[PDB]
Design a protein around this ligand. Structure first.
Ligand SMILES: *C(=O)[C@@H]1CC[C@@H]2C=C[C@H]3CCN(C(=O)[C@@H]4CC[C@H]5C=C[C@]6(CCCN6C(=O)[C@H](Cc6ccccc6Cl)NC(C)=O)C(=O)N54)[C@@H]3C(=O)N21
Lengths: 5, 109
């Protein structure tokens, strides 16, 4: 997800 | 060692305990990811280095029989006994290049 990236 | 491909990807590993992907090496951003072939024993490795600071964030062996999971056209992943790895490619072209070279490796091992 964008939260992880 | 001979490089058989280069592809741009953010290299992730899966933190099972917290069910999250985290950046390989603890370093967000893209890497240049090779598959290197060692011809003497016909072995192959995935080695990736951060574009900016050149840190090696992945260096793993590709075993015969690996299941290479093309989860999406830009995110491919595989697992071994210790870790799960993901490559979030910069483009579909990068993913195709890398998957081509990985499938070649898996066919000649
Ligand atoms: C956010 O976008 C993060 C970081 C970028 C990356 C990109 C695209 C997404 C595509 C889906 N996805 C997942 O991570 C999926 C979502 C469901 C989640 C559950 C388990 C995951 C993570 C742990 C490994 N895994 C698997 O599904 C493996 C897949 C696999 C199959 C066969 C051979 C090897 C492997 Cl690794 N299955 C199992 C049982 O381990 C997974 O991939 N998930 C991406 C992101 O969310 N994502």
């Amino acid at each position: 997800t964008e939260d992880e990236l | 060692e001979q490089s058989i491909c280069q592809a741009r990807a953010a290299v992730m590993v899966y933190d099972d305990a917290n069910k999250k992907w985290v950046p390989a090496g603890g370093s967000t951003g893209f890497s240049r990811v090779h598959i290197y072939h060692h011809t003497g024993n016909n072995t192959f490795r995935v080695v990736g280095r951060k574009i900016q600071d050149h840190q090696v964030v992945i260096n793993c062996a590709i075993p015969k029989g690996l299941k290479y999971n093309q989860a999406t056209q830009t995110f491919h992943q595989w697992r071994d006994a210790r870790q799960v790895y993901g490559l979030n490619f910069g483009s579909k072209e990068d993913a195709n290049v890398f998957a081509s070279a990985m499938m070649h490796a898996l066919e000649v091992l």
